[PDB]
Design a protein around this nucleic acid. Structure first.
Ligand SMILES: [Zn+2]
Lengths: 49, 103, 117, 50, 50, 48, 48
DNA sequence: GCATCCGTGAGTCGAGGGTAATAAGCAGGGATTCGCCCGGGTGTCAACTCTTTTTTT
DNA sequence: AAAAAAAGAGTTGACACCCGGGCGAATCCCTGCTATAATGGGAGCTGTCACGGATGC
C-alpha cells in the first residue's frame, strides 16, 4: 500500500517497482484528444507517471 | 478613499507634472502610500608669485596656504617635466624610494 | 526556501569518464523532443476521428466540428457558434449532448476506445 | 502497440512472415576493408548470440 | 534559428587573422607581426599622416 | 528502434544505459562508398 | 562503494646524466645532458 | 643562405556514474508579487409553445 | 374509410461558476555610505617526434 514491492516478490522486465507520481503543470492538448476525452467523460489527471 | 474617474485623473496629473510619490497619497486624501504605487504601476506610465588663474605650462603647482582663504597662490617657477617644483618634489613624493617585489 | 539554490551549475564539457572523452553532453536526454511513435499515433487518431464522424447527421457533425476545433485552427465558444447558427444559446447544448450520446455506442465507438486506454 | 508489449503468442507468426527476404547489414567494429559490411538474410533462432 | 549581436565600444582585432600561421594582417602594407602586436597591446604609438 | 535523442545535436544517444544507438563510424561510411550503394548511406545519415 | 588507492611510480628526485644516442643533431655526436630534478621545485639542466 | 623557434597528427566499437570549494552591514526610495473579492461571460437546468408520422379511430 | 400526440425543435427564465481585473498588503532589488594605519602576484610544464613552415644577420 505504501508503493514499494514486497520482499520476495517476482518481478518481470518493465514492471512498476516503486509507484511515484509527480505534479505536472497544465499543458495544452490537441483538439481531437479533448473531443475524445469529452466523449468518454474521463477527466485528465494533473500528475505525471 | 475613493477610486472614481476623477481620482485616477488627478493622480495621473500629479504623477506627470512632478512631485514626491510619498506626499501624493496625502494630498489626495484617504489613499495610502501603497495604493498610489500600485495604481501607477497597474495603470502604467511610471607666498608665491602666481595666482590660480595665471598658471601656465611648465610651472610649479604646489599649493601654499588655504584655498578658502584670502591669499592663496602657487610658487610658479621653472618646474618643467613635473607638476611640483624641485624644492617640493623631495618633500611631496616618498623620500628614499626603496620598494621591490616579484614578477 | 533559502536552501536549495542550485548555485554554480556543472559545466556540460566536464569529462564524465576518467579519460578526456565521454563528456557530460552525451549522457543527457532531450525532453522537448517528441518521439516519432507518438506523432504516428496522432495521425491515426486524426484519421479515425473523421471516419467515426460519418453516421451522424450534417447538422450535429457541423456543430461538433465548430465547437471542437477538429478541422479548424481557432476554437469557437457556445455563443460564437450560436450567433452563426439558428439556435442562439440553448439548443446547441442539446445538439451536442445528442451527438455525444450517438458516439457513446460501442458499435460506433469501438475502434475509438483503444486511444484512451 | 499494446499487443506487442504483452508479447502475445500470435505476434510470433507475424514476425516470421515479415522477416522473409528483408536483408540486414552486419559489420564488425574495426571496419578495415569494404568486406566488413555484408548483408544477410535474418532467420529467427533461440538464444541471445547472433 | 535566431541570432543576436553584441555592440562593442572599441574595435577589436580578429584572433584568426592575427595569430594564424601566415600573418594575414602583416601581409598587408608590409608590416611585421612583431610591430602589430605592440600597437594592439597599447605599448607603443604609431604615427600616420606625416 | 526508437529512443531518446540528444539535446543540442538532435541525434540518438549512445551507450546501452538508456536505449543507445550503434554509432555509424567514419570507417563504416567508407565501406558503403566502396560499394555502389548510394541510397542506403544517404538515408542512414539523414532520415534516421 | 569502497575505493582503493593504487601506488604511483615516477622518477627518483636525483641528479641524472643522460646523453642522446646521436639524435636531434646535425651530425653524429653526443650531448651528455645532466639534470638536477628535485622533488618540489624548479628543474635544472646543464646540456652541452 | 642557414639557424632557431612555434602550429598539427596520434583507431575503433564497447563498458561506467554521481561530483566538488569563499561567505560585511545598514538606511533610504521604488518596482514586484501574492490574497481577496466583485464580476461579467460560460455552462447546466426547470419549464412553456409549433410540426407531424403515424398509431390509433 | 378518418385524426391528434411522445418526440423533435425552439426557446424562456433561473441559477452555478470560473478565471479576469482591480484593491490591497506585504515584501523584493538598487544604490550609497561606513573615516586610526593598511600600498606589485601563484600555478604551469620540463618522460613523443617529425614535419612544416615562420622569423633574424
Ligand atoms: Zn613649489
Amino acid at each position: 500500500e505504501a508503493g514499494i514491492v514486497a520482499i520476495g516478490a517476482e518481478v518481470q522486465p518493465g514492471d512498476i517497482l516503486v509507484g511515484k507520481v509527480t505534479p505536472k503543470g497544465e499543458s495544452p492538448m490537441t483538439p481531437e484528444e479533448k473531443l475524445l476525452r469529452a466523449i468518454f467523460g474521463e477527466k485528465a489527471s494533473d500528475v505525471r507517471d | 478613499m475613493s477610486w472614481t474617474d476623477e481620482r485616477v485623473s488627478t493622480l495621473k496629473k500629479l504623477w506627470l507634472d512632478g512631485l514626491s510619490a510619498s506626499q501624493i497619497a496625502k494630498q489626495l486624501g484617504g489613499v495610502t502610500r501603497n495604493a498610489v504605487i500600485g495604481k501607477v504601476h497597474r495603470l502604467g506610465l511610471s607666498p608665491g608669485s602666481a595666482t590660480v588663474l595665471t598658471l601656465g605650462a611648465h610651472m610649479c603647482k604646489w599649493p601654499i596656504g588655504d584655498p578658502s582663504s584670502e591669499g592663496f597662490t602657487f610658487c610658479g617657477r621653472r618646474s618643467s617635466e613635473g607638476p611640483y617644483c624641485v624644492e617640493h618634489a623631495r618633500v611631496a613624493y616618498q623620500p628614499q624610494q626603496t620598494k621591490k617585489k616579484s614578477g | 526556501k533559502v536552501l536549495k539554490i542550485a548555485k554554480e551549475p556543472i559545466s556540460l564539457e566536464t569529462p564524465i569518464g576518467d579519460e578526456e572523452d565521454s563528456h557530460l553532453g552525451d549522457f543527457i536526454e532531450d525532453k522537448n523532443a517528441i518521439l516519432p511513435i507518438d506523432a504516428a499515433i496522432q495521425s491515426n487518431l486524426r484519421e479515425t476521428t473523421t471516419r467515426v464522424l460519418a453516421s451522424l447527421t450534417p447538422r450535429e457533425e457541423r456543430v461538433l466540428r465548430m465547437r471542437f476545433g477538429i478541422g479548424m485552427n481557432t476554437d469557437h465558444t457556445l455563443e460564437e457558434v450560436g450567433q452563426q447558427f439558428s439556435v442562439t444559446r440553448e439548443r446547441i447544448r442539446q445538439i451536442e449532448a445528442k451527438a455525444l450520446r450517438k458516439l457513446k455506442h460501442p458499435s460506433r465507438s469501438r475502434k475509438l476506445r483503444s486511444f484512451l486506454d | 502497440k499494446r499487443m506487442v508489449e504483452r508479447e502475445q503468442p500470435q505476434v510470433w507468426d507475424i514476425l516470421e512472415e515479415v522477416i522473409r527476404e528483408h536483408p540486414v547489414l552486419l559489420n564488425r567494429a574495426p571496419t578495415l576493408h569494404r568486406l566488413g559490411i555484408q548483408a544477410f538474410e535474418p532467420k529467427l533462432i533461440e538464444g541471445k548470440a547472433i | 534559428e535566431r541570432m543576436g549581436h553584441i555592440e562593442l565600444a572599441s574595435p577589436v582585432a580578429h584572433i584568426w587573422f592575427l595569430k594564424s600561421l601566415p600573418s594575414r594582417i602583416a601581409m598587408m602594407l608590409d608590416m611585421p607581426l612583431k610591430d602589430i602586436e605592440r600597437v594592439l597591446y597599447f605599448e607603443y604609438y604609431i604615427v600616420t599622416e606625416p | 528502434s526508437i529512443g531518446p535523442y540528444s539535446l543540442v545535436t538532435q541525434q540518438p544517444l549512445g551507450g546501452k544505459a538508456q536505449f543507445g544507438g550503434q554509432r555509424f563510424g567514419e570507417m563504416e561510411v567508407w565501406a558503403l562508398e566502396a560499394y555502389g550503394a548510394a541510397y542506403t548511406l544517404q538515408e542512414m545519415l539523414t532520415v534516421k | 562503494t569502497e575505493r582503493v588507492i593504487v601506488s604511483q611510480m615516477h622518477r627518483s628526485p636525483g641528479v641524472f646524466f643522460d646523453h642522446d644516442k646521436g639524435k636531434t643533431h646535425a651530425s653524429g655526436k653526443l650531448l651528455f645532458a645532466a639534470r638536477v630534478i628535485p622533488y618540489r621545485g624548479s628543474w635544472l639542466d646543464f646540456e652541452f
